[PDB]
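Quick one - inputs below.
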Amino acid sequence: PTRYGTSESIDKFKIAWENVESVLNMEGNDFVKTIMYAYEDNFPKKDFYMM
Amino acid sequence: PNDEATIKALDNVIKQIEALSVIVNRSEKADDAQILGPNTYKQLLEHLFS
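Output:
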């Protein structure tokens, strides 16, 4: 809940995104990974992480 | 949910945090002083008469 919730600097986002990127290459999750990397511009990573 | 992926994620997180916690900063800078080698006075010529 606390300790850098919605009010964080952008520089802290890479550390959190590292785990999601590691999970998204687990040999069987290729569908979502490809959909993400193809349409990143329209659906940026921040809102995906929030969802 | 696949229970293998979360174990790998936890292992990676633990490795990262503990690697970041072993680094210690310790510098060995020397002083900005000098050495002050030996020296002697040099005399200048003069003239004398009486």
